[PDB]
Amino acid sequence: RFIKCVTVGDGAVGKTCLLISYTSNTFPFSANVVLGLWDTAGEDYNRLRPLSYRGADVFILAFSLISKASYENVSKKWIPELKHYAPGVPIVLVGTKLDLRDDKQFFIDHAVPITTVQGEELKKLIGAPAYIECSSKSQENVKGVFDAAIRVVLQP
């Protein structure tokens, strides 16, 4: 009846904002439904970050929908890391910053978008049971992230 969830992913992808959005319903860590949420720092921390993983029931592996590099780093860095420290714990893959992907003006001002179908193909590649695209800014699908997280750990 407890669920430790650890959020991981590159710098600036939106991990802390994701937790603030879910828990506080605002945009600048625990919940009860009928869930402990851990934040991490995503290279200086290579040795210390993994310490947070012990007894994790699920990982939220975030990458940014506006950043091809964070997309590439899921397979390059994060998967190898989680498999070393916590093989077998399920992964919910989250593409953050959905509000920016929607906005043509963002790419004029700035960035390479990741499509829903490409996020889905990455999901399959890493064996994640879930892939959710979300925006902490608009809050869209943020509740969905954590609802996936609980569904994927709880029996059935």
Ligand SMILES: Nc1nc2c(ncn2[C@@H]2O[C@H](COP(=O)(O)OP(=O)(O)O)[C@@H](O)[C@H]2O)c(=O)[nH]1
């Ligand atoms: N537009 C937009 N900006 C975001 C979103 N999530 C985070 N940010 C911005 O991205 C930056 C990094 O967010 P932060 O949560 O601190 O990322 P973290 O390093 O992964 O923890 C901040 O400038 C945020 O305001 C989002 O959904 N939409």
Ligand SMILES: [Mg+2]
């Ligand atoms: Mg943070």
